[PDB]
Amino acid sequence: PTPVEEAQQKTIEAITKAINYMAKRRIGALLTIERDTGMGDYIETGIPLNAKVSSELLINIFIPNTPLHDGAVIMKNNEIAAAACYLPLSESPFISKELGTRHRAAVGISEVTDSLTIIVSEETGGVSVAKNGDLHRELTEEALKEMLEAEFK
Amino acid sequence: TPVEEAQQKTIEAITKAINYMAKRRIGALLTIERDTGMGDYIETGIPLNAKVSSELLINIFIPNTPLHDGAVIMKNNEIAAAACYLPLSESPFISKELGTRHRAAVGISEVTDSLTIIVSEETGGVSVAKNGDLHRELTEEALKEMLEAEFK
């Protein structure tokens, strides 16, 4: 693999380790991966970080009742660009009625960008992904990893 | 000047984080690299190279989280790394009630010209280690003066 390929795989491993940890602990999380549609307008609503990715930093961001936990983390290639970012809320009727604002925000950004958003439910620990206006719920660890690898292909 | 405004913004971010941690008696260890390079200690932690903000500093030091166990090292107006090793001082002149966090701050200050801020988990007291000495029980004004003197 090229350095770009190695760096992408390290980023995927960091994201999946963080998501898995948060899912087991029922730590709510909202993580958007910017793709080809630029998300600068949303990144600028958050607290700038421009930080190297690590699973440790991703987990620390989402700990309940902390300064960075309320809103979305937006990742740009191999960096955490900003935390506590605003995303627009979807009104789609295909969002399960029991789901709250994190999932609606995720679907909402997926309606106006080609980004991939991961959501961890604070109620159930279930992991979902929003892409292209659709929410895909109850993902296994293997399904999430494959989704990310296919996204970064 | 722009450089002066950036240094002030960083001081404000550090002091806001320190105040929050002191109030909640969150232990913390924050080393500001100066002329002596600290790359060998930076390398022991989790790389960040992040923008400074009070929010990020507070999120790092939350007890029982991946990043809280060690020092944050700042360099060139950024957070270089978290959870870094610092060497323990063997000085017999540190207050005997103080533990490893304070001994680590004094230890790095023995071998570098860095400034290290410590918040005690026992009391929320704020101290600064520099040149092998620990300056204890600082007021907010006292810490700001130290940061401004350091950066002058």
- Please say whether the beta carbons of B34 and B115 come within 8 A: yes
Interface test with B, best of A56, A74, A78, A80 (most B CBs within 10 A): A56
Whose CA is closest to B119, among B57, B76, B42, B64?
A: B57
Question: Cα A22 from chain centroid?
Answer: 12
Whose CA is closest to B100, among B140, B136, B65, B71?
A: B71
- Here the tokens at position A131 are 């892409």
| Cα–Cα dist B128/B132, whole Å | 10
Q: What angle do CA A85, A88, A89 make, to 5 degrees?
A: 120
Q: Which residues in B lie closer than 8 A to residue A83 (C-beta atoms)? A: 55
3-state secondary structure of A6: helix
Select the residue of B50, B55, B82 nearest A50 (Cβ to Cβ): B50
- Please say whether the beta carbons of B84 and B72 come within 8 A: yes
Contact criterion met (CB < 8 Å) for A56 and B49: no
- Please say whether the beta carbons of A30 and A99 come within 8 A: no
- Here the tokens at position A72 are 């979305």
* CATH architecture, domain B2-151: 3-Layer(aba) Sandwich (3.40)
Q: Which residues in B lie closer than 8 A to residue A84 (C-beta atoms)? A: 55
Method: X-ray
* CATH architecture, domain A3-151: 3-Layer(aba) Sandwich (3.40)
- Please say whether the beta carbons of A18 and A58 come within 8 A: yes
Pairing of strands B78-84, B46-51: antiparallel
| Cα–Cα dist A110/A151, whole Å | 14
- Please say whether the beta carbons of A39 and B40 come within 8 A: no
| Cα–Cα dist B14/B17, whole Å | 5
* Strands, E assignment, B41-125: 46-51, 71-75, 78-84, 115-119
Neighbours of A138 (CB within 10 A): 10
* Distance from the first to the final alpha carbon of chain B: 13
Question: Cα B32 from chain centroid?
Answer: 6
Contact criterion met (CB < 8 Å) for B46 and A56: yes
Whose CA is closest to B92, among B119, B110, B74?
A: B110
Write down the domain spans for chain B. 2-151
Whose CA is closest to A120, among A142, A92, A139, A145?
A: A139
Residues of A near B (CB-CB distance < 8 A)?
A: 47-52, 54-57, 59-61, 63, 66-69, 83-84
3-state secondary structure of A92: coil
